[PDB]
Protein backbone atom coordinates (compact mmCIF):
# COMPACT_ATOMS: atom_id res chain seq x y z
CA UNK A 1 0.00 0.00 0.00
CA UNK A 2 2.47 2.69 -1.17
CA UNK A 3 2.08 6.31 0.04
CA UNK A 4 4.24 8.84 -1.86
CA UNK A 5 4.32 12.52 -0.83
CA UNK A 6 6.44 15.44 -2.01
CA UNK A 7 9.01 16.91 0.36
CA UNK A 8 10.10 20.54 0.10
CA UNK A 9 13.05 21.89 1.95
CA UNK A 10 13.03 25.64 2.08
CA UNK A 11 16.05 26.82 0.20
CA UNK A 12 16.67 23.40 -1.30
CA UNK A 13 17.37 23.52 -5.05
CA UNK A 14 14.72 20.92 -5.94
CA UNK A 15 12.02 18.79 -4.35
CA UNK A 16 11.93 15.10 -3.54
CA UNK A 17 9.32 12.35 -3.05
CA UNK A 18 9.20 9.57 -0.40
CA UNK A 19 7.13 6.45 0.16
CA UNK A 20 5.77 6.83 3.68
CA UNK A 21 4.73 3.18 3.78
CA UNK A 22 8.39 2.11 3.76
CA UNK A 23 8.94 3.63 7.23
CA UNK A 24 7.56 2.73 10.61
CA UNK A 25 8.31 5.42 13.19
CA UNK A 26 8.61 9.20 12.98
CA UNK A 27 12.25 8.82 14.00
CA UNK A 28 12.56 6.27 11.19
CA UNK A 29 11.17 8.93 8.86
CA UNK A 30 13.28 11.76 10.28
CA UNK A 31 16.70 10.19 9.75
CA UNK A 32 15.55 9.04 6.29
CA UNK A 33 14.94 12.63 5.23
CA UNK A 34 18.11 14.09 6.73
CA UNK A 35 20.00 11.77 4.35
CA UNK A 36 17.93 12.83 1.32
CA UNK A 37 18.93 16.45 1.99
CA UNK A 38 22.31 15.42 3.42
CA UNK A 39 24.13 16.78 0.38
CA UNK A 40 22.38 20.11 1.00
CA UNK A 41 22.78 20.01 4.80
CA UNK A 42 26.60 19.83 4.89
CA UNK A 43 28.11 23.27 4.26
CA UNK A 44 22.87 18.72 13.28
CA UNK A 45 19.37 18.97 11.80
CA UNK A 46 17.84 22.40 12.76
CA UNK A 47 14.67 22.21 10.59
CA UNK A 48 11.10 21.46 11.71
CA UNK A 49 8.79 19.23 9.62
CA UNK A 50 5.25 20.15 8.65
CA UNK A 51 2.71 18.23 6.59
CA UNK A 52 -0.52 19.23 4.96
CA UNK A 53 -3.82 17.45 5.62
CA UNK A 54 -6.62 16.66 3.18
CA UNK A 55 -8.40 19.97 3.84
CA UNK A 56 -5.32 21.88 2.64
CA UNK A 57 -3.83 23.21 5.90
CA UNK A 58 -0.35 22.86 7.40
CA UNK A 59 0.06 20.82 10.58
CA UNK A 60 3.22 20.08 12.54
CA UNK A 61 4.68 16.59 12.38
CA UNK A 62 4.66 14.31 15.40
CA UNK A 63 1.42 15.01 17.29
CA UNK A 64 -0.86 12.39 15.72
CA UNK A 65 0.65 8.88 16.07
CA UNK A 66 2.41 7.44 13.05
CA UNK A 67 -0.25 5.12 11.51
CA UNK A 68 -2.81 7.94 11.22
CA UNK A 69 -0.08 10.28 10.04
CA UNK A 70 0.67 8.13 6.97
CA UNK A 71 -2.97 8.42 5.88
CA UNK A 72 -3.46 12.13 6.81
CA UNK A 73 -0.41 13.78 5.19
CA UNK A 74 -0.43 14.71 1.48
CA UNK A 75 2.75 16.86 1.25
CA UNK A 76 5.81 17.64 3.35
CA UNK A 77 7.75 20.83 4.10
CA UNK A 78 10.80 21.43 6.26
CA UNK A 79 11.06 25.00 7.56
CA UNK A 80 14.11 26.80 8.96
CA UNK A 81 13.98 28.43 12.42
CA UNK B 1 -1.18 11.85 -29.21
CA UNK B 2 2.24 11.12 -27.58
CA UNK B 3 4.24 12.85 -24.83
CA UNK B 4 7.18 14.60 -26.57
CA UNK B 5 8.58 16.20 -23.44
CA UNK B 6 11.22 18.93 -23.74
CA UNK B 7 14.71 18.28 -22.35
CA UNK B 8 16.85 21.38 -21.76
CA UNK B 9 20.43 22.17 -20.73
CA UNK B 10 22.03 25.58 -20.33
CA UNK B 11 24.52 26.15 -23.16
CA UNK B 12 23.33 23.31 -25.36
CA UNK B 13 20.23 23.52 -27.53
CA UNK B 14 17.08 21.79 -26.33
CA UNK B 15 15.57 18.49 -27.40
CA UNK B 16 12.14 16.87 -27.39
CA UNK B 17 11.76 13.22 -26.47
CA UNK B 18 8.96 10.81 -25.63
CA UNK B 19 9.45 9.21 -22.23
CA UNK B 20 7.27 6.18 -23.03
CA UNK B 21 9.94 5.04 -25.51
CA UNK B 22 11.85 3.83 -22.41
CA UNK B 23 10.73 1.40 -19.73
CA UNK B 24 12.60 2.55 -16.61
CA UNK B 25 14.43 5.58 -15.29
CA UNK B 26 17.86 4.24 -16.21
CA UNK B 27 17.05 4.05 -19.93
CA UNK B 28 15.73 7.61 -19.78
CA UNK B 29 18.91 8.93 -18.20
CA UNK B 30 21.21 6.89 -20.44
CA UNK B 31 19.49 8.31 -23.51
CA UNK B 32 19.64 11.88 -22.23
CA UNK B 33 23.27 11.25 -21.31
CA UNK B 34 24.24 10.25 -24.83
CA UNK B 35 22.33 13.23 -26.28
CA UNK B 36 24.37 15.91 -24.52
CA UNK B 37 27.64 14.02 -24.24
CA UNK B 38 27.26 13.59 -20.48
CA UNK B 39 27.73 9.82 -20.68
CA UNK B 40 28.24 8.36 -17.21
CA UNK B 41 27.24 11.40 -15.14
CA UNK B 42 23.48 10.93 -14.72
CA UNK B 43 23.73 7.18 -14.07
CA UNK B 44 26.56 6.74 -11.66
CA UNK B 45 26.69 4.74 -8.42
CA UNK B 46 28.58 7.61 -6.81
CA UNK B 47 26.21 10.51 -7.65
CA UNK B 48 28.28 12.56 -10.09
CA UNK B 49 27.19 16.04 -8.99
CA UNK B 50 25.10 16.61 -12.07
CA UNK B 51 21.39 16.50 -11.30
CA UNK B 52 18.42 15.76 -13.57
CA UNK B 53 15.10 17.37 -12.57
CA UNK B 54 11.63 17.76 -14.02
CA UNK B 55 8.53 19.90 -13.71
CA UNK B 56 5.22 18.18 -13.07
CA UNK B 57 1.82 19.50 -13.97
CA UNK B 58 1.48 20.92 -10.48
CA UNK B 59 4.45 23.21 -11.41
CA UNK B 60 6.94 21.95 -8.82
CA UNK B 61 10.55 21.03 -9.59
CA UNK B 62 11.45 17.51 -8.58
CA UNK B 63 14.35 15.13 -8.83
CA UNK B 64 13.96 12.51 -11.53
CA UNK B 65 13.70 8.99 -10.13
CA UNK B 66 11.62 9.28 -6.93
CA UNK B 67 8.12 8.88 -8.35
CA UNK B 68 7.39 5.38 -9.66
CA UNK B 69 7.94 5.27 -13.40
CA UNK B 70 4.26 4.83 -14.20
CA UNK B 71 3.10 7.94 -12.38
CA UNK B 72 6.00 10.04 -13.59
CA UNK B 73 5.31 9.54 -17.31
CA UNK B 74 1.91 11.09 -16.65
CA UNK B 75 3.16 13.83 -14.31
CA UNK B 76 6.25 14.98 -16.21
CA UNK B 77 5.93 18.17 -18.28
CA UNK B 78 9.47 19.40 -18.94
CA UNK B 79 12.89 18.01 -18.02
CA UNK B 80 16.11 19.92 -17.34
CA UNK B 81 19.81 19.21 -16.75
CA UNK B 82 21.69 20.96 -13.93
CA UNK B 83 25.47 21.34 -13.80
CA UNK B 84 27.17 21.21 -10.39
CA UNK B 85 27.43 24.98 -10.51
CA UNK B 86 23.78 25.44 -11.54
CA UNK B 87 22.64 23.15 -8.70
CA UNK B 88 24.16 25.71 -6.46
CA UNK B 89 22.98 29.01 -7.82
CA UNK B 90 19.70 27.35 -6.80
CA UNK B 91 20.72 26.43 -3.23
CA UNK B 92 20.94 28.89 -0.35
Swiss-Prot record, chain A:
Aux/IAA proteins are short-lived transcriptional factors that function as repressors of early auxin response genes at low auxin concentrations. Repression is thought to result from the interaction with auxin response factors (ARFs), proteins that bind to the auxin-responsive promoter element (AuxRE). Formation of heterodimers with ARF proteins may alter their ability to modulate early auxin response genes expression. Phosphorylated by phytochrome A in vitro. Belongs to the Aux/IAA family. Induction: By auxin. Residues 2-81 form the PB1 domain. It is found in: Nucleus. This is Auxin-responsive protein IAA17. Homodimers and heterodimers. Interacts with the auxin response factors ARF1 and IAA24. Interacts with IAA1. Interacts with TPL. Interacts (via PB1 domain) with ARF7 (via PB1 domain). Changing residue 6 to A: No effect on interaction with ARF7. Increased auxin response of mutants axr3-1 and axr3-3 may result from an increased stability of AXR3. The N-terminal half of the protein contains two conserved domains I and II. Domain I includes a slightly degenerated ERF-associated amphiphilic repression (EAR) motif which seems to be involved in the activity of transcriptional repression. Domain II is required for the correct degradation of the protein through the SCF-mediated ubiquitin-proteasome pathway. Interactions between Aux/IAA proteins and auxin response factors (ARFs) occur through their C-terminal dimerization domains III and IV.
Swiss-Prot record, chain B:
It comes from the Eukaryota. Residues 2-86 form the PB1 domain. It is found in: Nucleus. Expressed in the whole plant with a lower expression in leaves. Detected in embryo axis, provascular tissues, procambium and some differentiated vascular regions of mature organs. Auxin response factors (ARFs) are transcriptional factors that bind specifically to the DNA sequence 5'-TGTCTC-3' found in the auxin-responsive promoter elements (AuxREs). Seems to act as transcriptional activator. Formation of heterodimers with Aux/IAA proteins may alter their ability to modulate early auxin response genes expression. Mediates embryo axis formation and vascular tissues differentiation. Functionally redundant with ARF7. May be necessary to counteract AMP1 activity. Interactions between auxin response factors (ARFs) and Aux/IAA proteins occur through their C-terminal dimerization domains III and IV. Homodimers and heterodimers. Interacts with BRX and the auxin-responsive proteins IAA1, IAA12 (BODENLOS), IAA17 and ARF7. Belongs to the ARF family. Absence of the protein probably causes early embryonic lethality. Premature stop codons are associated with vascular defects. This is Auxin response factor 5. It comes from Arabidopsis thaliana (Mouse-ear cress). The gene is ARF5. The chain holds residues 792 to 883 of 902 of the full protein.
Amino acid sequence: AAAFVKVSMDGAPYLRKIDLRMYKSYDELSNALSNMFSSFTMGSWDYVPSYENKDGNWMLVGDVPWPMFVDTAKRLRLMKG
Amino acid sequence: VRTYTDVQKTGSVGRSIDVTSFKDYEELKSAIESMFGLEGLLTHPQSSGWKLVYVDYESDVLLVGDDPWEEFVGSVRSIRILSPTEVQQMSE
